[PDB]
Amino acid sequence: QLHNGLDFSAKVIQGSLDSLPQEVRKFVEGNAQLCQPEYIHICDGSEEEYGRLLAHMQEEGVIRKLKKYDNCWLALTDPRDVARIESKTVIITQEQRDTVPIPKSGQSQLGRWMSEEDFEKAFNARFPGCMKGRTMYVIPFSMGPLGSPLAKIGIELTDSPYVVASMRIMTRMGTSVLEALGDGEFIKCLHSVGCPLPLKKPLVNNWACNPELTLIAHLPDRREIISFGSGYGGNSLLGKKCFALRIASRLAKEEGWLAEHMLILGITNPEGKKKYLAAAFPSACGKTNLAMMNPTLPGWKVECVGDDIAWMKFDAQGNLRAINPENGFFGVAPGTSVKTNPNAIKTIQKNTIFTNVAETSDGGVYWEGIDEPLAPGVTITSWKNKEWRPQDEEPCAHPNSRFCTPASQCPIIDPAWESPEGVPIEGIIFGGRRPAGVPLVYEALSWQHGVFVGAAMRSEATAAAEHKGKVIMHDPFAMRPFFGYNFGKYLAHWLSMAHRPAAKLPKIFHVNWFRKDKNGKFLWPGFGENSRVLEWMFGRIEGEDSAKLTPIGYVPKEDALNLKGLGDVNVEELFGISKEFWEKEVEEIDKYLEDQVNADLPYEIERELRALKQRISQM
Ligand SMILES: Nc1nc2c(ncn2[C@@H]2O[C@H](COP(=O)(O)OP(=O)(O)OP(=O)(O)O)[C@@H](O)[C@H]2O)c(=O)[nH]1
Ligand SMILES: O=C([O-])C(=O)[O-]
Ligand SMILES: [Mn+2]
Ligand SMILES: [Mn+2]
Numbered sequence: 290q291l292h293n294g295l296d297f298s299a300k301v302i303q304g305s306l307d308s309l310p311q312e313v314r315k316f317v318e319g320n321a322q323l324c325q326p327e328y329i330h331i332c333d334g335s336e337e338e339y340g341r342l343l344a345h346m347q348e349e350g351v352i353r354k355l356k357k358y359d360n361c362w363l364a365l366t367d368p369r370d371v372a373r374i375e376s377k378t379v380i381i382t383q384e385q386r387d388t389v390p391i392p393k394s395g396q397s398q399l400g401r402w403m404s405e406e407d408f409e410k411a412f413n414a415r416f417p418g419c420m421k422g423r424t425m426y427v428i429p430f431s432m433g434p435l436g437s438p439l440a441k442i443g444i445e446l447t448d449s450p451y452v453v454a455s456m457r458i459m460t461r462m463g464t465s466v467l468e469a470l471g472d473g474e475f476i477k478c479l480h481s482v483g484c485p486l487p488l489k490k491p492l493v494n495n496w497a498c499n500p501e502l503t504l505i506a507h508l509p510d511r512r513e514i515i516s517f518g519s520g521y522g523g524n525s526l527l528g529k530k531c532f533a534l535r536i537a538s539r540l541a542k543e544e545g546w547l548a549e550h551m552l553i554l555g556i557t558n559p560e561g562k563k564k565y566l567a568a569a570f571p572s573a574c575g576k577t578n579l580a581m582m583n584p585t586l587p588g589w590k591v592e593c594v595g596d597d598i599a600w601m602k603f604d605a606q607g608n609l610r611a612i613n614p615e616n617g618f619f620g621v622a623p624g625t626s627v628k629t630n631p632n633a634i635k636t637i638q639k640n641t642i643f644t645n646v647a648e649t650s651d652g653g654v655y656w657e658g659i660d661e662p663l664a665p666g667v668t669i670t671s672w673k674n675k676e677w678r679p680q681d682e683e684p685c686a687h688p689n690s691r692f693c694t695p696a697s698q699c700p701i702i703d704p705a706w707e708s709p710e711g712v713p714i715e716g717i718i719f720g721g722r723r724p725a726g727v728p729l730v731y732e733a734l735s736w737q738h739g740v741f742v743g744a745a746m747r748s749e750a751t752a753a754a755e756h757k758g759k760v761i762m763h764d765p766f767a768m769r770p771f772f773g774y775n776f777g778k779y780l781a782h783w784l785s786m787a788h789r790p791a792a793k794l795p796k797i798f799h800v801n802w803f804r805k806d807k808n809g810k811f812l813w814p815g816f817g818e819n820s821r822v823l824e825w826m827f828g829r830i831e832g833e834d835s836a837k838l839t840p841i842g843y844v845p846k847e848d849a850l851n852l853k854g855l856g857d858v859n860v861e862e863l864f865g866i867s868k869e870f871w872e873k874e875v876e877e878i879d880k881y882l883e884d885q886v887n888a889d890l891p892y893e894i895e896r897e898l899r900a901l902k903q904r905i906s907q908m
């Protein structure tokens with residue numbers, strides 16, 4: 290070097306650039322040159338590091354300690370930074386069609402492509418100087434069990450201590466991962482809240498963010514993820530949606546595996562027979578509650594492998610094996626109670642970070658549906674940091690408030706949840722929020738029909754992103770926000786699985802926990818009662834003659850579902866299938882797939898469309 294090169298050793302306040310693998314050092318120093326942090330902190334993942342970082346944020350007023358619990362914390366964000374923003378989430382490729390199919394008219398509903406040229410301009414308008422006056426934290430993280438050959442390692446640079454703390458829970462993080470990495474490749478992840486000091490704009494709720502310039506970008510051809518302006522975990526915990534769904538789904542297509550928005554659970558019957566199941570439901574549509582359900586049926590047991598992301602690959606014996614690449618649960622808080630999700634309540638009692646929930650005056654947490662009466666005199670601070678009472682018009686917790694909690698604390702975490710070879714999946718469940726028309730459970734007729742059922746998924750909008758109201762949206766495979774490449778090609782890749790050597794193709798089901806009667810009341814109580822539906826699925830996988838053929842697939846025979854203790858359920862409305870509803874449903878799906886998937890729609894999916902239309906027509 291003729292001066293100091295890109296040597297940023299003088300600014301390192303933890304660790305050493307010298308001890309980094311060469312390529313990690315280059316990534317760090319290149320982005321230090323660009324972003325101009327004051328300091329560089331190389332994370333070690335230690336308890337000491339964690340506790341001190343938390344106590345620092347506390348003194349600053351960035352987070353509060355929840356004094357009622359063992360090592361739990363509460364962050365309240367700027368109300369502009371509360372969920373994913375799909376319209377600001379983009380994938381960069383040379384050709385648009387590699388990222389999304391070209392629709393018959395208008396822009397794709399299956400992702401958002403940005404050209405290399407446009408992204409360069411966007412990047413230059415955001416990143417230079419962005420970390421001035423701040424610390425750049427270097428987070429070495431593993432997606433998958435540490436030192437597993439299945440794992441994928443990343444390095445996330447961020448100026449947000451909230452992100453460091455959340456990454457420690459949600460991934461395997463620290464020096465151990467650098468030691469496991471060695472001179473290997475890693476996913477390059479760059480994050481900034483986009484508020485260099487001195488602040489050009491007023492800071493809201495001590496929550497640094499830049500809503501106007503928020504942009505969550507993926508550059509799969511450069512193995513980079515670059516996210517600006519948002520601290521919300523879906524936008525800032527780059528291992529999770531960005532890497533483990535978007536980047537990984539494209540790698541998966543190329544390499545013969547699958548990366549999916551699915552829980553993985555193990556279920557054991559009263560005879561001690563155990564099976565694993567995967568389930569894809571859209572954001573805020575029930576995965577975490579199923580994955581750690583407490584079954585109401587006696588003698589059944591559920592165990593949790595993962596609640597959100599599954600990586601799956603057929604082995605040589607033909608088993609579809611699944612691993613959970615995450616290390617924690619980043620779960621929707623509202624609705625969570627001892628009644629609905631007791632295993633989550635137990636998990637989150639210690640070492641948990643909450644975002645955008647309410648705080649009680651004795652230092653506990655509160656949210657809609659927590660179903661815990663407070664002692665007279667105890668008062669509530671809403672997520673907006675204002676005094677709140679139960680009869681107030683607005684909720685005390687944001688609808689997308691979250692807990693972020695170690696998976697190892699789940700009282701029913703599966704013994705094999707960190708096994709590198711993964712667990713053998715025998716059933717795949719699809720489903721979402723449909724208040725009308727769609728019955729409690731049905732079973733696909735074949736693998737190709739089941740891929741069609743995944744493709745045809747529709748679900749009421751939730752608060753997990755920017756969609757408002759109760760519009761029923763397409764959300765194929767619960768992947769609409771997450772495809773890393775062209776969805777037509779994704780469908781072809783799923784179809785191609787039918788030919789894996791020795792393949793033991795999982796049975797495919799579709800569920801609906803959310804059908805309502807004419808008064809808006811849920812027809813099905815859900816939560817632990819969903820064990821009744823899992824029982825039926827389990828018997829179907831065992832080959833039990835417990836099903837009746839219908840135009841949409843198989844449903845339970847009369848008396849097949851165990852409804853003991855649920856004698857008030859209206860089985861007729863709940864399982865009702867209307868020709869008029871389904872004729873309209875099939876035409877809507879046909880228009881969506883042909884318009885949005887277009888030249889890239891596989892023949893087999895169009896054939897399943899035709900077949901469903903025909904069976905409905907014979908009603
Ligand atoms: N009525 C009803 N509500 C449910 C059921 N399961 C979950 N919910 C509610 O739906 C909301 C979201 O459920 P989660 O299990 O957190 O959803 P998720 O699929 O894990 O969502 P992401 O983490 O955003 O992917 C919570 O408010 C739950 O209480 C159910 O069986 N019936
Ligand atoms: O945060 C999530 O898990 C989501 O939006 O699906
Ligand atoms: Mn999710
Ligand atoms: Mn979840």
Ligand code: NA
Nearest residue numbers: 365366494495
């Ligand atoms: Na705050």
